[PDB]
mmCIF file of C-alpha atoms in Angstrom:
data_model
loop_
_atom_site.group_PDB
_atom_site.id
_atom_site.type_symbol
_atom_site.label_atom_id
_atom_site.label_comp_id
_atom_site.label_asym_id
_atom_site.label_seq_id
_atom_site.Cartn_x
_atom_site.Cartn_y
_atom_site.Cartn_z
ATOM 1 C CA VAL A 1 -27.906 66.165 -44.655
ATOM 2 C CA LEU A 2 -28.271 69.193 -43.821
ATOM 3 C CA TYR A 3 -25.754 70.767 -41.812
ATOM 4 C CA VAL A 4 -26.060 75.154 -40.866
ATOM 5 C CA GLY A 5 -23.429 75.724 -38.398
ATOM 6 C CA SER A 6 -22.552 72.579 -36.098
ATOM 7 C CA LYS A 7 -19.222 71.456 -35.043
ATOM 8 C CA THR A 8 -19.675 67.663 -35.860
ATOM 9 C CA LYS A 9 -17.083 64.489 -34.704
ATOM 10 C CA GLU A 10 -18.378 61.441 -36.157
ATOM 11 C CA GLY A 11 -16.389 58.634 -35.845
ATOM 12 C CA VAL A 12 -13.532 60.020 -33.912
ATOM 13 C CA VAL A 13 -10.840 58.131 -31.775
ATOM 14 C CA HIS A 14 -9.083 61.012 -29.694
ATOM 15 C CA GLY A 15 -6.351 59.629 -27.268
ATOM 16 C CA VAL A 16 -4.606 56.386 -27.457
ATOM 17 C CA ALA A 17 -1.695 57.622 -24.579
ATOM 18 C CA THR A 18 -0.272 54.951 -23.471
ATOM 19 C CA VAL A 19 3.184 54.456 -21.344
ATOM 20 C CA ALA A 20 5.322 51.547 -21.049
ATOM 21 C CA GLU A 21 8.273 49.883 -20.725
ATOM 22 C CA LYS A 22 9.210 46.617 -21.695
ATOM 23 C CA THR A 23 7.138 44.295 -24.340
ATOM 24 C CA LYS A 24 7.151 41.683 -25.905
ATOM 25 C CA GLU A 25 4.586 40.255 -28.445
ATOM 26 C CA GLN A 26 5.406 36.623 -29.555
ATOM 27 C CA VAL A 27 2.737 35.390 -32.065
ATOM 28 C CA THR A 28 3.163 32.337 -34.347
ATOM 29 C CA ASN A 29 -0.044 31.547 -36.512
ATOM 30 C CA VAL A 30 -0.487 28.744 -39.104
ATOM 31 C CA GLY A 31 -3.367 30.446 -41.732
ATOM 32 C CA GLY A 32 -5.703 32.604 -39.194
ATOM 33 C CA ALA A 33 -5.361 36.178 -39.268
ATOM 34 C CA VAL A 34 -3.557 38.050 -35.847
ATOM 35 C CA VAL A 35 -2.657 41.864 -35.153
ATOM 36 C CA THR A 36 -1.538 43.035 -31.266
ATOM 37 C CA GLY A 37 0.020 46.372 -30.265
ATOM 38 C CA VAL A 38 -1.765 49.925 -29.388
ATOM 39 C CA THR A 39 -4.789 49.922 -32.230
ATOM 40 C CA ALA A 40 -7.011 52.582 -33.501
ATOM 41 C CA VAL A 41 -8.912 51.428 -36.235
ATOM 42 C CA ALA A 42 -11.487 54.116 -36.513
ATOM 43 C CA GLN A 43 -14.051 54.682 -39.324
ATOM 44 C CA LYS A 44 -17.640 56.468 -40.058
ATOM 45 C CA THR A 45 -20.376 54.487 -42.532
ATOM 46 C CA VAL A 46 -19.099 50.431 -42.810
ATOM 47 C CA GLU A 47 -20.891 49.245 -45.189
ATOM 48 C CA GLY A 48 -20.859 45.654 -44.548
ATOM 49 C CA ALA A 49 -17.788 45.061 -44.462
ATOM 50 C CA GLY A 50 -15.013 43.485 -43.114
ATOM 51 C CA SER A 51 -13.426 42.524 -39.586
ATOM 52 C CA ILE A 52 -10.242 44.211 -38.100
ATOM 53 C CA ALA A 53 -9.539 40.651 -37.595
ATOM 54 C CA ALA A 54 -11.138 37.978 -40.340
ATOM 55 C CA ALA A 55 -10.524 34.760 -40.571
ATOM 56 C CA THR A 56 -12.483 33.072 -43.759
ATOM 57 C CA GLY A 57 -11.091 29.196 -43.731
ATOM 58 C CA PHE A 58 -12.727 27.081 -46.061
ATOM 59 C CA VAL B 1 -30.733 65.196 -41.121
ATOM 60 C CA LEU B 2 -30.838 69.303 -39.981
ATOM 61 C CA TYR B 3 -28.516 70.954 -37.543
ATOM 62 C CA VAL B 4 -29.083 74.456 -36.443
ATOM 63 C CA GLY B 5 -25.657 74.864 -34.187
ATOM 64 C CA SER B 6 -25.458 71.972 -31.798
ATOM 65 C CA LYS B 7 -22.799 70.325 -31.547
ATOM 66 C CA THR B 8 -22.670 66.219 -31.501
ATOM 67 C CA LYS B 9 -20.188 63.718 -31.178
ATOM 68 C CA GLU B 10 -21.924 59.900 -32.243
ATOM 69 C CA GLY B 11 -19.414 57.284 -32.647
ATOM 70 C CA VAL B 12 -16.637 58.789 -30.479
ATOM 71 C CA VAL B 13 -13.717 57.459 -28.325
ATOM 72 C CA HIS B 14 -11.808 59.616 -26.332
ATOM 73 C CA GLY B 15 -9.445 59.301 -24.046
ATOM 74 C CA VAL B 16 -7.667 55.842 -23.487
ATOM 75 C CA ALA B 17 -4.756 56.595 -21.269
ATOM 76 C CA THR B 18 -3.040 53.969 -19.991
ATOM 77 C CA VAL B 19 0.952 52.738 -18.101
ATOM 78 C CA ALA B 20 1.707 49.194 -17.559
ATOM 79 C CA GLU B 21 5.648 48.342 -16.441
ATOM 80 C CA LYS B 22 6.515 44.749 -18.687
ATOM 81 C CA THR B 23 3.896 43.444 -21.033
ATOM 82 C CA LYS B 24 4.485 39.433 -22.666
ATOM 83 C CA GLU B 25 1.409 39.161 -25.075
ATOM 84 C CA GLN B 26 1.835 35.269 -26.614
ATOM 85 C CA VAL B 27 -0.597 34.173 -29.138
ATOM 86 C CA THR B 28 -0.179 30.942 -30.679
ATOM 87 C CA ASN B 29 -3.048 30.185 -33.079
ATOM 88 C CA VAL B 30 -3.829 27.833 -36.220
ATOM 89 C CA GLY B 31 -7.185 28.940 -37.930
ATOM 90 C CA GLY B 32 -8.470 31.626 -36.084
ATOM 91 C CA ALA B 33 -8.587 35.817 -35.680
ATOM 92 C CA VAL B 34 -6.997 37.185 -32.357
ATOM 93 C CA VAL B 35 -6.829 40.699 -31.384
ATOM 94 C CA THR B 36 -4.653 41.796 -27.864
ATOM 95 C CA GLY B 37 -3.207 44.614 -26.522
ATOM 96 C CA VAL B 38 -4.869 48.383 -26.848
ATOM 97 C CA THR B 39 -7.379 48.766 -28.698
ATOM 98 C CA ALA B 40 -9.856 51.655 -29.869
ATOM 99 C CA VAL B 41 -12.549 50.266 -32.794
ATOM 100 C CA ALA B 42 -14.796 52.802 -33.189
ATOM 101 C CA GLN B 43 -17.611 53.340 -35.501
ATOM 102 C CA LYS B 44 -20.846 54.860 -36.035
ATOM 103 C CA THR B 45 -22.818 53.053 -38.895
ATOM 104 C CA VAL B 46 -22.341 49.374 -39.037
ATOM 105 C CA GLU B 47 -25.204 47.981 -41.344
ATOM 106 C CA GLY B 48 -24.403 44.479 -41.010
ATOM 107 C CA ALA B 49 -20.376 44.678 -40.637
ATOM 108 C CA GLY B 50 -18.552 42.112 -39.348
ATOM 109 C CA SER B 51 -16.735 41.502 -35.658
ATOM 110 C CA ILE B 52 -13.115 43.215 -34.447
ATOM 111 C CA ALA B 53 -12.226 38.888 -34.339
ATOM 112 C CA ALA B 54 -14.100 37.241 -37.333
ATOM 113 C CA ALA B 55 -13.863 33.157 -37.386
ATOM 114 C CA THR B 56 -16.049 31.659 -40.418
ATOM 115 C CA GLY B 57 -14.963 28.714 -40.134
ATOM 116 C CA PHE B 58 -15.803 25.692 -42.501
ATOM 117 C CA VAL C 1 -34.086 64.592 -36.621
ATOM 118 C CA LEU C 2 -34.042 68.223 -36.345
ATOM 119 C CA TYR C 3 -31.888 69.758 -33.602
ATOM 120 C CA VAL C 4 -32.341 73.549 -33.103
ATOM 121 C CA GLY C 5 -28.948 74.397 -30.303
ATOM 122 C CA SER C 6 -28.255 70.981 -28.750
ATOM 123 C CA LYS C 7 -24.832 69.110 -27.265
ATOM 124 C CA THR C 8 -25.770 65.498 -27.434
ATOM 125 C CA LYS C 9 -23.218 62.294 -27.134
ATOM 126 C CA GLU C 10 -24.629 59.833 -28.325
ATOM 127 C CA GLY C 11 -23.150 56.612 -28.904
ATOM 128 C CA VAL C 12 -19.363 57.148 -26.582
ATOM 129 C CA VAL C 13 -16.810 56.147 -24.178
ATOM 130 C CA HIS C 14 -15.166 58.560 -22.712
ATOM 131 C CA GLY C 15 -12.793 57.098 -20.167
ATOM 132 C CA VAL C 16 -10.522 53.872 -20.109
ATOM 133 C CA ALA C 17 -7.598 55.177 -17.765
ATOM 134 C CA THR C 18 -5.907 52.084 -16.607
ATOM 135 C CA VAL C 19 -2.615 51.128 -14.460
ATOM 136 C CA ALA C 20 -1.003 48.390 -14.128
ATOM 137 C CA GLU C 21 2.233 46.618 -13.088
ATOM 138 C CA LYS C 22 2.247 43.338 -15.237
ATOM 139 C CA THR C 23 0.483 41.672 -18.458
ATOM 140 C CA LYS C 24 1.094 38.087 -19.379
ATOM 141 C CA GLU C 25 -2.113 37.611 -22.412
ATOM 142 C CA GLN C 26 -1.850 33.849 -23.235
ATOM 143 C CA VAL C 27 -3.762 32.753 -25.771
ATOM 144 C CA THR C 28 -3.551 29.666 -27.920
ATOM 145 C CA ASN C 29 -7.352 29.377 -30.309
ATOM 146 C CA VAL C 30 -7.621 26.860 -33.124
ATOM 147 C CA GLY C 31 -10.370 27.862 -34.588
ATOM 148 C CA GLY C 32 -12.611 30.566 -32.951
ATOM 149 C CA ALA C 33 -12.034 34.508 -31.797
ATOM 150 C CA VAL C 34 -9.635 36.163 -29.074
ATOM 151 C CA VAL C 35 -9.807 39.306 -28.206
ATOM 152 C CA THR C 36 -8.039 40.150 -24.965
ATOM 153 C CA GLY C 37 -6.259 43.358 -23.523
ATOM 154 C CA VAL C 38 -8.147 47.023 -23.773
ATOM 155 C CA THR C 39 -10.831 47.336 -25.498
ATOM 156 C CA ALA C 40 -13.332 50.641 -25.731
ATOM 157 C CA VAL C 41 -14.987 49.383 -28.942
ATOM 158 C CA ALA C 42 -18.017 52.851 -29.561
ATOM 159 C CA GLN C 43 -20.625 52.682 -32.029
ATOM 160 C CA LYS C 44 -24.348 54.736 -32.853
ATOM 161 C CA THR C 45 -25.794 52.440 -35.580
ATOM 162 C CA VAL C 46 -25.684 48.686 -35.157
ATOM 163 C CA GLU C 47 -28.141 47.454 -37.518
ATOM 164 C CA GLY C 48 -27.976 43.356 -37.618
ATOM 165 C CA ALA C 49 -23.819 44.235 -37.893
ATOM 166 C CA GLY C 50 -20.892 41.708 -36.174
ATOM 167 C CA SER C 51 -20.471 41.169 -32.601
ATOM 168 C CA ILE C 52 -16.853 42.352 -31.564
ATOM 169 C CA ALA C 53 -15.685 38.115 -30.931
ATOM 170 C CA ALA C 54 -16.854 36.178 -33.979
ATOM 171 C CA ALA C 55 -17.520 32.432 -34.290
ATOM 172 C CA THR C 56 -19.668 31.369 -36.824
ATOM 173 C CA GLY C 57 -18.791 27.574 -37.176
ATOM 174 C CA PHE C 58 -19.801 25.071 -39.448
ATOM 175 C CA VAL D 1 29.508 54.147 -3.978
ATOM 176 C CA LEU D 2 30.077 51.001 -6.025
ATOM 177 C CA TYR D 3 28.824 49.055 -8.330
ATOM 178 C CA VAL D 4 29.459 45.493 -9.657
ATOM 179 C CA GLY D 5 26.543 44.723 -12.376
ATOM 180 C CA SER D 6 23.927 46.845 -10.922
ATOM 181 C CA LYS D 7 21.147 48.708 -13.193
ATOM 182 C CA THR D 8 20.754 51.916 -11.657
ATOM 183 C CA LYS D 9 17.069 54.767 -12.871
ATOM 184 C CA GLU D 10 18.018 57.405 -10.230
ATOM 185 C CA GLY D 11 16.363 60.713 -10.697
ATOM 186 C CA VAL D 12 14.455 60.064 -13.920
ATOM 187 C CA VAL D 13 11.436 61.204 -16.099
ATOM 188 C CA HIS D 14 9.753 58.373 -18.012
ATOM 189 C CA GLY D 15 6.884 59.056 -20.053
ATOM 190 C CA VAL D 16 5.043 62.419 -20.245
ATOM 191 C CA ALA D 17 3.125 60.735 -22.943
ATOM 192 C CA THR D 18 -0.273 63.670 -23.313
ATOM 193 C CA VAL D 19 -2.830 64.604 -26.065
ATOM 194 C CA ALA D 20 -5.142 68.072 -25.452
ATOM 195 C CA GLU D 21 -7.330 69.558 -28.255
ATOM 196 C CA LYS D 22 -6.718 73.212 -27.775
ATOM 197 C CA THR D 23 -4.407 75.254 -25.381
ATOM 198 C CA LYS D 24 -4.458 78.694 -24.615
ATOM 199 C CA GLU D 25 -1.958 79.939 -21.861
ATOM 200 C CA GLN D 26 -2.978 83.081 -21.098
ATOM 201 C CA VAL D 27 -0.077 84.952 -18.098
ATOM 202 C CA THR D 28 0.358 88.179 -17.126
ATOM 203 C CA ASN D 29 2.717 88.997 -14.050
ATOM 204 C CA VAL D 30 4.627 91.804 -12.987
ATOM 205 C CA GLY D 31 7.261 91.177 -10.482
ATOM 206 C CA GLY D 32 7.813 87.337 -10.351
ATOM 207 C CA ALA D 33 8.048 84.162 -12.320
ATOM 208 C CA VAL D 34 5.044 81.399 -13.470
ATOM 209 C CA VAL D 35 5.914 78.629 -15.850
ATOM 210 C CA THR D 36 3.079 76.955 -17.598
ATOM 211 C CA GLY D 37 2.449 74.243 -20.296
ATOM 212 C CA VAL D 38 4.080 70.707 -19.830
ATOM 213 C CA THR D 39 7.104 70.813 -17.581
ATOM 214 C CA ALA D 40 9.949 67.645 -16.440
ATOM 215 C CA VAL D 41 12.498 69.052 -14.590
ATOM 216 C CA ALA D 42 14.197 66.277 -13.972
ATOM 217 C CA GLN D 43 17.638 66.529 -11.184
ATOM 218 C CA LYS D 44 19.836 63.689 -9.324
ATOM 219 C CA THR D 45 22.030 66.334 -6.560
ATOM 220 C CA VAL D 46 19.634 69.241 -5.749
ATOM 221 C CA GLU D 47 22.541 70.942 -3.125
ATOM 222 C CA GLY D 48 20.646 72.835 -1.000
ATOM 223 C CA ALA D 49 19.581 74.687 -5.324
ATOM 224 C CA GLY D 50 16.450 77.066 -6.892
ATOM 225 C CA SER D 51 13.183 75.920 -7.575
ATOM 226 C CA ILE D 52 11.183 75.524 -10.604
ATOM 227 C CA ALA D 53 9.906 78.937 -10.016
ATOM 228 C CA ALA D 54 11.761 81.495 -7.703
ATOM 229 C CA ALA D 55 10.360 84.844 -6.381
ATOM 230 C CA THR D 56 13.339 86.564 -4.102
ATOM 231 C CA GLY D 57 11.475 89.836 -4.287
ATOM 232 C CA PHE D 58 12.504 92.131 -2.124
ATOM 233 C CA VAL E 1 27.109 52.272 -1.153
ATOM 234 C CA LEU E 2 27.102 48.885 -2.738
ATOM 235 C CA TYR E 3 25.361 46.861 -5.075
ATOM 236 C CA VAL E 4 26.373 43.544 -6.248
ATOM 237 C CA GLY E 5 23.248 43.374 -9.209
ATOM 238 C CA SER E 6 20.103 44.847 -7.643
ATOM 239 C CA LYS E 7 18.345 46.673 -9.939
ATOM 240 C CA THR E 8 17.012 50.301 -8.773
ATOM 241 C CA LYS E 9 14.729 52.629 -9.152
ATOM 242 C CA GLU E 10 15.770 55.200 -6.617
ATOM 243 C CA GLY E 11 13.653 58.816 -7.463
ATOM 244 C CA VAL E 12 12.242 58.128 -10.358
ATOM 245 C CA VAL E 13 8.723 59.261 -12.260
ATOM 246 C CA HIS E 14 6.976 56.899 -14.553
ATOM 247 C CA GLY E 15 3.893 57.473 -16.776
ATOM 248 C CA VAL E 16 2.056 60.433 -16.749
ATOM 249 C CA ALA E 17 -0.354 59.704 -19.436
ATOM 250 C CA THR E 18 -2.822 62.646 -19.888
ATOM 251 C CA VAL E 19 -5.060 62.785 -21.809
ATOM 252 C CA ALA E 20 -7.608 66.601 -21.941
ATOM 253 C CA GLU E 21 -10.404 68.481 -24.828
ATOM 254 C CA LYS E 22 -9.872 71.847 -23.969
ATOM 255 C CA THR E 23 -7.149 73.728 -21.732
ATOM 256 C CA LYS E 24 -7.289 78.001 -20.293
ATOM 257 C CA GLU E 25 -4.973 78.319 -17.685
ATOM 258 C CA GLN E 26 -5.270 81.869 -17.396
ATOM 259 C CA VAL E 27 -2.441 83.673 -14.402
ATOM 260 C CA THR E 28 -2.031 87.179 -13.028
ATOM 261 C CA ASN E 29 0.491 86.979 -10.516
ATOM 262 C CA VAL E 30 1.948 90.426 -8.707
ATOM 263 C CA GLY E 31 4.525 89.191 -7.289
ATOM 264 C CA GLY E 32 5.172 85.338 -6.654
ATOM 265 C CA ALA E 33 5.402 81.757 -7.937
ATOM 266 C CA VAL E 34 2.617 80.229 -10.272
ATOM 267 C CA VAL E 35 2.986 76.805 -11.953
ATOM 268 C CA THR E 36 0.494 75.231 -13.534
ATOM 269 C CA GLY E 37 -0.231 72.788 -16.401
ATOM 270 C CA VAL E 38 1.464 69.157 -16.295
ATOM 271 C CA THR E 39 3.959 69.164 -14.030
ATOM 272 C CA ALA E 40 6.995 65.626 -13.730
ATOM 273 C CA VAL E 41 9.429 67.177 -10.880
ATOM 274 C CA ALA E 42 11.520 64.356 -10.210
ATOM 275 C CA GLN E 43 14.689 64.320 -7.812
ATOM 276 C CA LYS E 44 16.847 61.975 -5.550
ATOM 277 C CA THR E 45 18.549 63.728 -2.523
ATOM 278 C CA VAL E 46 17.515 67.732 -2.177
ATOM 279 C CA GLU E 47 20.259 68.518 0.261
ATOM 280 C CA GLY E 48 17.987 72.195 1.955
ATOM 281 C CA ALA E 49 16.991 73.034 -1.100
ATOM 282 C CA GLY E 50 14.086 75.017 -2.369
ATOM 283 C CA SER E 51 10.614 74.556 -3.527
ATOM 284 C CA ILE E 52 9.294 73.959 -7.045
ATOM 285 C CA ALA E 53 7.474 76.891 -6.286
ATOM 286 C CA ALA E 54 8.912 79.566 -4.221
ATOM 287 C CA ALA E 55 7.767 82.972 -2.716
ATOM 288 C CA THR E 56 10.660 84.324 -0.906
ATOM 289 C CA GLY E 57 8.689 87.508 0.042
ATOM 290 C CA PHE E 58 10.623 90.257 2.122
ATOM 291 C CA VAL F 1 23.666 49.850 1.958
ATOM 292 C CA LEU F 2 24.813 46.800 0.656
ATOM 293 C CA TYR F 3 22.381 45.119 -2.077
ATOM 294 C CA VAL F 4 23.711 41.047 -3.558
ATOM 295 C CA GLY F 5 20.896 40.943 -6.218
ATOM 296 C CA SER F 6 17.366 42.902 -5.211
ATOM 297 C CA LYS F 7 14.895 44.965 -7.026
ATOM 298 C CA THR F 8 14.290 48.191 -5.180
ATOM 299 C CA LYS F 9 11.660 50.934 -6.211
ATOM 300 C CA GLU F 10 13.019 53.673 -3.500
ATOM 301 C CA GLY F 11 10.527 57.004 -4.481
ATOM 302 C CA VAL F 12 8.702 56.359 -7.199
ATOM 303 C CA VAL F 13 5.408 57.247 -8.203
ATOM 304 C CA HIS F 14 4.272 55.366 -11.059
ATOM 305 C CA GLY F 15 1.130 55.927 -13.224
ATOM 306 C CA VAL F 16 -0.434 58.995 -13.005
ATOM 307 C CA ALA F 17 -3.455 58.361 -16.058
ATOM 308 C CA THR F 18 -5.278 61.143 -16.214
ATOM 309 C CA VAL F 19 -8.744 61.800 -18.560
ATOM 310 C CA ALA F 20 -10.019 64.966 -18.993
ATOM 311 C CA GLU F 21 -12.776 67.202 -21.514
ATOM 312 C CA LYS F 22 -12.375 70.787 -20.507
ATOM 313 C CA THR F 23 -10.215 72.364 -17.810
ATOM 314 C CA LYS F 24 -10.051 75.655 -16.451
ATOM 315 C CA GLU F 25 -7.417 77.232 -13.646
ATOM 316 C CA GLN F 26 -7.118 80.465 -13.260
ATOM 317 C CA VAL F 27 -4.475 81.162 -10.605
ATOM 318 C CA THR F 28 -4.991 85.482 -9.928
ATOM 319 C CA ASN F 29 -1.912 85.726 -6.784
ATOM 320 C CA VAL F 30 -0.294 88.565 -4.811
ATOM 321 C CA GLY F 31 2.636 87.609 -3.326
ATOM 322 C CA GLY F 32 2.262 83.457 -2.696
ATOM 323 C CA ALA F 33 3.147 80.622 -4.459
ATOM 324 C CA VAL F 34 0.651 78.476 -6.076
ATOM 325 C CA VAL F 35 0.771 75.310 -8.096
ATOM 326 C CA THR F 36 -2.183 73.740 -9.932
ATOM 327 C CA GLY F 37 -2.238 70.848 -13.070
ATOM 328 C CA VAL F 38 -1.030 67.604 -12.473
ATOM 329 C CA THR F 39 1.899 67.402 -10.734
ATOM 330 C CA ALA F 40 3.858 64.318 -9.849
ATOM 331 C CA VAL F 41 6.774 65.044 -6.904
ATOM 332 C CA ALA F 42 8.959 62.177 -6.033
ATOM 333 C CA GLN F 43 12.299 62.612 -4.009
ATOM 334 C CA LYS F 44 13.807 60.460 -2.024
ATOM 335 C CA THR F 45 15.879 61.806 0.756
ATOM 336 C CA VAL F 46 14.822 65.268 1.556
ATOM 337 C CA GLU F 47 17.484 65.916 3.772
ATOM 338 C CA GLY F 48 15.140 69.392 5.390
ATOM 339 C CA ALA F 49 14.624 71.305 1.865
ATOM 340 C CA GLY F 50 11.876 72.620 0.843
ATOM 341 C CA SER F 51 8.034 72.168 0.004
ATOM 342 C CA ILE F 52 6.405 72.060 -3.375
ATOM 343 C CA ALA F 53 4.841 75.491 -2.718
ATOM 344 C CA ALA F 54 6.297 78.270 -0.292
ATOM 345 C CA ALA F 55 5.359 81.109 0.602
ATOM 346 C CA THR F 56 8.503 82.197 3.688
ATOM 347 C CA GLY F 57 6.362 85.566 4.029
ATOM 348 C CA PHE F 58 8.637 89.189 6.241
#
């Protein structure tokens, strides 16, 4: 609301360093969501919002 | 509400260093959500919001 | 509410260093959520919000 | 000397992933060698050869 | 000397994943060698050769 | 000398994952070697060779 010289880092992912030799991601879905591999979602304010993998269904 | 020179880190993931040689992620879903692999979700305010893997169903 | 020069780390995951040689994540769901692998969720204020693996069902 | 279908990785550095926010390298030498920062020297056969920081002197 | 379908990794560094926020390397030498920061030297055959920080002196 | 389908990892460093927030390396030498910070030397055959920090002196 009122900052007088601060330093903020609200809602941050910092450093996802990753090392791999092989990678075989094998997804076969039908009617839903799938998210694989590296993922670095970063939000500050989520006002009743969705997931990172949503499946509403019927 | 009022900062007079502080230093804040509200809602942060910092450092997800990872080392692997092989990786075989094998998902076969039908009607739901799946999230695999490295994941570094980082939020500050979640006002009644979703998950990181939601399955609403019927 | 009022900081006069403090240093805060409210809601932080710091350091998830991980070392592996092989990895075989094998999920086969039908109607629910699944989350595997490294995961570093980090939140500050969760006002009656969701999980990191939700299954609402009927 | 004789390979009949192998797969070799003799003398390799593989993956030096690095994440930083600030960096202040401050060297003041007079009569010697200095090497700083990321360095990924990679050799196979070193037949009585030099270092990665040599100082012969008098 | 004789490989008939093997898979070798002779002399390898694999994965030096590193995460940092600040870094202040402050070297002041006079007559010798200095090596700082990340370093991933990788050799196979070192036939009476040098170091990674040599100081011969007088 | 003779491999008929093996899988070898002779002389390997694998996984040096590291997480830090601050780092202040402060070296002031005169006539010798200094090596600091992360270091992942990896050799297979060292036939009477040098160190990773040599100081010959007089």
